[PDB]
Amino acid sequence: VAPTLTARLYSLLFRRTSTFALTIVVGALFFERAFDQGADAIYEHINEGKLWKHIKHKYENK
Amino acid sequence: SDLELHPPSYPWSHRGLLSSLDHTSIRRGFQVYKQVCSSCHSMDYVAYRHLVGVCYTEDEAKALAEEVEVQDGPNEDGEMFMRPGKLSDYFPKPYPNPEAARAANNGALPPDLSYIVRARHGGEDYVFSLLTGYCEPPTGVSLREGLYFNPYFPGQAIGMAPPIYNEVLEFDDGTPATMSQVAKDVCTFLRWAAEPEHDHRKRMGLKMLLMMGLLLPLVYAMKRHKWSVLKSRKLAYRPPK
Amino acid sequence: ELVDPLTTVREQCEQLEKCVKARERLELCDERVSSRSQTEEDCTEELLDFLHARDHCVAHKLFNSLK
Amino acid sequence: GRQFGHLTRVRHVITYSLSPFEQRAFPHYFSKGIPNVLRRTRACILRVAPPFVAFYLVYTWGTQEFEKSKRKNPAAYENDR
Amino acid sequence: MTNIRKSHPLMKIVNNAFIDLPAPSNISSWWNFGSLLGICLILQILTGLFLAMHYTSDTTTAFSSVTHICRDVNYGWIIRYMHANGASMFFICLYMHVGRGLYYGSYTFLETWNIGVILLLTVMATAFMGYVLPWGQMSFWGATVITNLLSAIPYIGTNLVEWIWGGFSVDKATLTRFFAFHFILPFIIMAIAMVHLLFLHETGSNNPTGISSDVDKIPFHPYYTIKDILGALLLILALMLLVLFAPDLLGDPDNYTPANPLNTPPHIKPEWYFLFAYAILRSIPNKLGGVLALAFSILILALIPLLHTSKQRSMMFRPLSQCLFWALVADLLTLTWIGGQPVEHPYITIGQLASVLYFLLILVLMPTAGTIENKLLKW
Amino acid sequence: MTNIRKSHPLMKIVNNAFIDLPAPSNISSWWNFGSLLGICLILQILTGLFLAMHYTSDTTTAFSSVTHICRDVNYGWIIRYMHANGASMFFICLYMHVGRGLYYGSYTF
Amino acid sequence: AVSASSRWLEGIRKWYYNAAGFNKLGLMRDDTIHENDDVKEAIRRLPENLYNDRVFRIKRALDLSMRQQILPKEQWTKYEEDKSYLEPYLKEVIRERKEREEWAKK
Ligand code: HEC
Ligand code: HEM
Ligand code: HEM
Ligand code: HEM
Numbered sequence A: 001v002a003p004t005l006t007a008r009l010y011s012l013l014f015r016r017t018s019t020f021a022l023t024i025v026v027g028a029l030f031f032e033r034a035f036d037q038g039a040d041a042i043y044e045h046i047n048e049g050k051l052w053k054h055i056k057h058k059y060e061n062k
Numbered sequence B: 001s002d003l004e005l006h007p008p009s010y011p012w013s014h015r016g017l018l019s020s021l022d023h024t025s026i027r028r029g030f031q032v033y034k035q036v037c038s039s040c041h042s043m044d045y046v047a048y049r050h051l052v053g054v055c056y057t058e059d060e061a062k063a064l065a066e067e068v069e070v071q072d073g074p075n076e077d078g079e080m081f082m083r084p085g086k087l088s089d090y091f092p093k094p095y096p097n098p099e100a101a102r103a104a105n106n107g108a109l110p111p112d113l114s115y116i117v118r119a120r121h122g123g124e125d126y127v128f129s130l131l132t133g134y135c136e137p138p139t140g141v142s143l144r145e146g147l148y149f150n151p152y153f154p155g156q157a158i159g160m161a162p163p164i165y166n167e168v169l170e171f172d173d174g175t176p177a178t179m180s181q182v183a184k185d186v187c188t189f190l191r192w193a194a195e196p197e198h199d200h201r202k203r204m205g206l207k208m209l210l211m212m213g214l215l216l217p218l219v220y221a222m223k224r225h226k227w228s229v230l231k232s233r234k235l236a237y238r239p240p241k
Numbered sequence C: 001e002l003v004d005p006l007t008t009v010r011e012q013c014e015q016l017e018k019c020v021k022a023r024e025r026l027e028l029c030d031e032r033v034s035s036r037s038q039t040e041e042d043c044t045e046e047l048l049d050f051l052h053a054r055d056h057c058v059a060h061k062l063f064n065s066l067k
Numbered sequence D: 001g002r003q004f005g006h007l008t009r010v011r012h013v014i015t016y017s018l019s020p021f022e023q024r025a026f027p028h029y030f031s032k033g034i035p036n037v038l039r040r041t042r043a044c045i046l047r048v049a050p051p052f053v054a055f056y057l058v059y060t061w062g063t064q065e066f067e068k069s070k071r072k073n074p075a076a077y078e079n080d081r
Numbered sequence E: 001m002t003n004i005r006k007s008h009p010l011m012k013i014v015n016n017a018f019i020d021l022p023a024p025s026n027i028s029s030w031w032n033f034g035s036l037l038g039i040c041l042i043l044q045i046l047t048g049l050f051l052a053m054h055y056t057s058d059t060t061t062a063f064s065s066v067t068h069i070c071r072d073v074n075y076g077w078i079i080r081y082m083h084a085n086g087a088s089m090f091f092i093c094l095y096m097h098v099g100r101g102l103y104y105g106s107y108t109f110l111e112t113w114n115i116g117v118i119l120l121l122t123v124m125a126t127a128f129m130g131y132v133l134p135w136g137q138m139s140f141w142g143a144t145v146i147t148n149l150l151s152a153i154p155y156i157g158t159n160l161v162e163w164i165w166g167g168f169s170v171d172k173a174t175l176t177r178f179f180a181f182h183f184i185l186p187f188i189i190m191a192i193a194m195v196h197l198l199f200l201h202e203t204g205s206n207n208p209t210g211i212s213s214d215v216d217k218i219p220f221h222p223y224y225t226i227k228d229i230l231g232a233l234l235l236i237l238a239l240m241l242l243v244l245f246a247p248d249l250l251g252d253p254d255n256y257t258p259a260n261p262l263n264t265p266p267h268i269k270p271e272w273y274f275l276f277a278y279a280i281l282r283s284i285p286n287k288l289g290g291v292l293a294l295a296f297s298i299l300i301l302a303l304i305p306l307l308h309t310s311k312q313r314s315m316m317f318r319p320l321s322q323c324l325f326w327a328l329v330a331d332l333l334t335l336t337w338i339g340g341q342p343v344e345h346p347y348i349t350i351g352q353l354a355s356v357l358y359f360l361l362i363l364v365l366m367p368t369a370g371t372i373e374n375k376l377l378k379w
Numbered sequence F: 001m002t003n004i005r006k007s008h009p010l011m012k013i014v015n016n017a018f019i020d021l022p023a024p025s026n027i028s029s030w031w032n033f034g035s036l037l038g039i040c041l042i043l044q045i046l047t048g049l050f051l052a053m054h055y056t057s058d059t060t061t062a063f064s065s066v067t068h069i070c071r072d073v074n075y076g077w078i079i080r081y082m083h084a085n086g087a088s089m090f091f092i093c094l095y096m097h098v099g100r101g102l103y104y105g106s107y108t109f
Numbered sequence G: 001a002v003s004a005s006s007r008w009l010e011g012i013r014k015w016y017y018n019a020a021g022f023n024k025l026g027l028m029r030d031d032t033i034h035e036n037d038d039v040k041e042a043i044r045r046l047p048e049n050l051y052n053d054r055v056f057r058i059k060r061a062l063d064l065s066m067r068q069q070i071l072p073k074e075q076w077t078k079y080e081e082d083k084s085y086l087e088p089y090l091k092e093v094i095r096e097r098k099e100r101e102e103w104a105k106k
């Protein structure tokens, strides 16, 4: 039997205070970069042809 | 003491929560102002900065801006300008002055329409109806000559002669121009006016929501985690008695 | 031409019951008005009501029907 | 004095408790709690709701009472005279 | 307290008015409010502040600046509404804080009450001036009304009008005087805030049960702090939810209309929360009568602690009065909608009805009830 | 402290940080300053305040308002200078407070 | 001027006395009293056997509030069940100021 990630991760990170805090400080970076991107479509995928991002393709670069 | 009518609520491109504006009609409805409302009612508050939001290419509306302006500039080097240059500029007012404005419309004072939506009760359908409705004077009524009978007007008589008929104009697209369409194509325009951020601002709405459902159960977990002890109490009265 | 969907949709709604119903009252008013319009009598009150439910019908229809 | 020390005098109480890790944040949360809804929701509801109902009537009552009073002039006096 | 970081600066010894503040066991969410209140106050402070920067009060120009604010200023629009949209929320945060007061009748604490009294009275007056700032028509006339309401004092009334005015009109002085007040004022309130807390830390908190809980207390730092953490942010949601999706919902005041001194709007009501007070103004035909009616009407709160007659505190064990308690609740909520309407007769009478109804509820019924329960309960 | 009006409101117990604050015997006028400082601060607060009323900052207009202030405003002139003329005095009140500091080197605290 | 109606009164008592949770919640009429400064002196004169058994309830009592869990309805306190134990000692102190006050008049 092998320790589930938690047993590992706790021994890995949450135990040592910084280490615990460290990945916490890490996670948000990629997160928001991933988060900001992934959500926008959900907004945008719903909003289609009503915005020059879609509209101005009619007249953009002439 | 008129029964105050209320406009039936219409669906809209923006009506729903996440429902956005569509600039295609917005572009068109502009021309209307560029055609019609520049007659009297002004809008003072927006620069030519619209460009790409109403889809106008930087050049497109700039060159479009260029023609709009053009006044004096030679008073002993003290000026304003012809030909606006940049986008910061606003529209020329068809009247310099309420005196000049009102007399021209003969006692009527055309309002500036910039925020007027937020002024009037009942959103856009107020106007779209007010656009639509013109009725035949009932038997037993008369009007001031300029006043034209619509129950939508509060006193139900308005000096505004109905502007909109089918094909008042030709759209920028070339879409066949229709009283209702010409009317309805504008109704998105001012809806945009008072809130340029409207389209943009909704983003935060979806942004915050999924952000929001995160933490509360999380918090809700933590709290309980502490309270887990208190609600777990036991008591024992074991008096030496 | 172009005929609109707008006024097009009107008649299908004003076809409905309460429309002509009050529309009769409009006559009933105006009929009574007709000679008696010498008196204060006027039908504006009624026509509001007619138009009131009129377009609620029109609501569900022609907006979807326009461009 | 020192807030906790001199509070009161107490004798022969005993307390029993666990680490929070010993247990869970949902010890039959659904199952156990859902009944509790009633005994509280029934407790006050006897004492509280009805006054509002009276209000709500008045809301429609007076409005309706208002409505006729103006809305139709050819009512008390019809447009005859 | 050996090497405790509490005493090392003497300052943090004071900080032990919190960590080790003992606390009652059973506590409704309804005790979040006291702490909840200050929250709004802070978050506000910043908003109107950065807003204060780009805005200017100049009778001709001022309103124009605002247009500039939500439009061309970086994120100018989110900010205006924030400071505003906190306001009503804050008030609903208010009454609740009061609300807990009587339902547990904690007003047994004596001058503390009176403090909580005055503390409020200023606050409403504050945003009143704050509401002038937008310089809307409804602002203008609403401003114009209440001073014109003041004048009725039999001898000295006159000057004080044009004294506060600083003239015959609503003009600059009237405005830009206030832009000091509507601004300078709330700080002193904050200064006052702590005082209102001090007294409470004479005796320690009150409970739900009207029973001294001293047998059990709790260190504050671990726990209620948490429930705060929850209780705090919850506010923000609706607060942030209203603001974006349906900004103008509570933005029921409609006037961005540049105020016309000549022109009058079809309707004048103050904003939502005054209105019952304003409603009661209408009631008395005597214009002076309504004044001593209106202003006194709230002053009753001072008078409550005089009327506690019972032998047990918290209402939740006296069922009968509880009815009155709720009975009063809607009665307040009633005057709203009446106040929410013009001056036609069916409402008028109805409005005329609840007025004297109102006092009777508090002033007589409440003191009357408990007496009998004692006798009923053999006390 | 029997029936002492210090403890009756708990507040005035704090007020006993002053009445009974012990104090040194030999003291130069040079120890007036600490208390002296706050004086200016108060008197100021009012002056710029009532001044703040009629004045407005608008880049084009603002300065003009000031002219209006010392001239057409009731006693407008006395007031402007006050708020101003306190200022430097206050600063000279300042350094002295410092001045006492080193000459007795009290910075040991 | 009540005899049969006297009997007819007690129901509402017994009813009303059941209409306030403390009968369900395990209290008495005594322990629910508002605080009085005499009660202080009163509580002074209580012997522990009396004093203590008052106490342990409150501790037990409040606890349920946090969890809002009312006692099993049988174990609820009953109307016939009563003890005024507090009041008689309360009664004495009352008279005491009266006498003093009375003398204190003149
Ligand atoms: C005849 C010049 C003119 C035309 C063209 C014109 N306006 Fe009208 N408009 C007026 C005047 C003047 C009034 C008020 C008449 C009166 O007061 O009796 C008015 C009425 C209005 C009103 C309602 C009055 C109010 O107080 O809000 C609005 C809104 C309005 N116009 C906007 C528009 C719109 C939308 C169009 C395009 C359909 C338009 N104007 C075209 C001059 C004009
Ligand atoms: C924004 C205004 C106020 C703030 C910031 C404020 C702050 C607080 C805080 C932090 C508490 C402690 C927690 C609590 O008991 O609620 C409190 C308690 C209290 N306040 Fe204030 N309060 C305010 C308004 C008032 C008002 C208007 C009143 C009375 C009219 C009042 C009277 C009380 C009372 C009686 C308590 C104790 C209530 C109890 O024992 O449950 N407070 N207040
Ligand atoms: C509880 C705290 C406060 C309340 C209820 C309040 C009241 C108001 C009111 C009624 C308005 C106008 C409403 C509106 O514009 O929609 C407003 C806006 C404003 N308030 Fe306050 N005020 C408070 C604290 C402050 C603070 C802390 C500041 C400045 C730091 C301030 C300054 C302003 C300013 C400058 C505005 C202009 C923004 C605007 O009017 O749109 N107020 N505030
Ligand atoms: C307006 C600014 C200040 C005010 C209102 C103020 C207020 C006071 C007061 C009331 C005292 C007690 C009386 C006295 O000892 O002078 C005091 C003492 C003192 N202050 Fe401040 N002070 C101010 C500025 C400063 C500054 C700028 C410093 C140091 C840079 C300072 C350091 C001290 C010291 C060292 C003492 C004790 C001096 C002694 O023992 O004689 N203070 N201050």
Ligand code: HEM
Pocket (backbone or CB within 6 Å): F040, F041, F044, F045, F046, F047, F048, F049, F050, F051, F052, F055, F080, F083, F084, F087, F090
């Ligand atoms: C030690 C306290 C203060 C100092 C040293 C100070 C500094 C100044 C300065 C340098 C000026 C311009 C000098 C001049 O106009 O001749 C001034 C004027 C002014 N100060 Fe302050 N300030 C202080 C406190 C305040 C306060 C409390 C207020 C407002 C309540 C305030 C607001 C103003 C205003 C509104 C003016 C305009 C009057 C004018 O500039 O002529 N300042 N103050």
Ligand code: FES
Pocket (backbone or CB within 6 Å): none
């Ligand atoms: S004060 Fe103008 S009508 Fe009452």
